[PDB]
Amino acid sequence: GSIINETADDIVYRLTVIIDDRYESLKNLITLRADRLEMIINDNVSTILASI
Amino acid sequence: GSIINETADDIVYRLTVIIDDRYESLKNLITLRADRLEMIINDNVSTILASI
Amino acid sequence: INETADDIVYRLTVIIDDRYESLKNLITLRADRLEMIINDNVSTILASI
Amino acid sequence: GSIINETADDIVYRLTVIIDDRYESLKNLITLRADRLEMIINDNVSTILASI
């Protein structure tokens, strides 16, 4: 494409990679922490039920 | 010509779509995990209360 | 050309900030709600035995 | 090296800084709230188990 069109594509591409990377990191963190909370709750409930 | 202005507007438009799409995905994920935890907590507490 | 770059950066910063604030508010509100639900349920359990 | 490439690099760099800052802030908030939830759940479960 033209010089200006190619440059626009470059800017959008580069920032999309940055945005996607940060997005994936936050997604993974939220999933990890929520998954751990469910794991803890599951184990604790089992312990409570076994104790009374 | 007006191509620089139009290209700037296009860059902002394209990246707005990306930014908003990732935002919506995170918003939905956080809401889903929160709802899941609330349900798990309420269900488990009901079980506990009925067991003793 | 410098003014165009500034305009692009400003406009996208405004949008990024808007979505950031919304996520911050969501996380805070949902976390606060979960803490309340956990404590309320625990209070019921303790008062039950 | 050119003004066109320097401009693109400028836009990408400046917005990357903004994106990174917001990302770190959200990361820290998620970590803080998840840590609090684990503490509250642990505290409460220990209280329940010590009470019966």
What's the CATH number where B39 sits? 1.20.5.1060
Rounded Cα distance, A22 and D20, in Å: 8
At D20, list the tokens.
Answer: 């990174």
Question: How far, CA to CA in Å, does B10 sit from each of A9, A24, A39, B28, D13?
Answer: 10, 25, 46, 27, 19
Q: C19 with B30: CB under 8 angstroms? A: no
How many beta carbons lie within 10 A of that of residue A24, not counting itself?
Answer: 11
Chains with ≥3 CB–CB distances under 8 Å to D:
A, C
The count of structural domains within chain C is: 1
Within 8 A by CB and 6+ apart from D27, the residues are A25, A26, A29
Resolution in A: 1.5
Q: Hey, what are D34's tokens?
A: 């998840």
CB of A30 closer than 8 Å to CB of D29: no
Residues 6+ apart with CB under 8 A from A33: D30, D31, D34
Print the domain residue range for C11.
1-49
Chain D CB within 8 Å of residue A18 CB: yes
Place of tokens 């709230």: D33
Hey, which chains touch C, using 3+ CB pairs under 8 Å?
Answer: B, D
Q: Is A12 on the interface with D (CB under 8 A)?
A: no
Beta strands in C1-49 (DSSP E): none
Check: CB of residue D12 under 8 Å from CB of residue C6: no
DSSP annotation of D2 reads -
Yes or no, beta carbons of C23 and D26 under 8 Å apart: yes
Chain B with chain C: Cβ pairs closer than 8 A: 53
Which residue is listed with tokens 């900030």? C17
C-alpha to C-alpha distances, B50 to C37, D39, D43, nearest whole angstrom: 18, 26, 22
DSSP secondary structure, A9-45, as one string: HHHHHHHHHHHHHHHHHHHHHHHHHHHHHHHHHHHHH
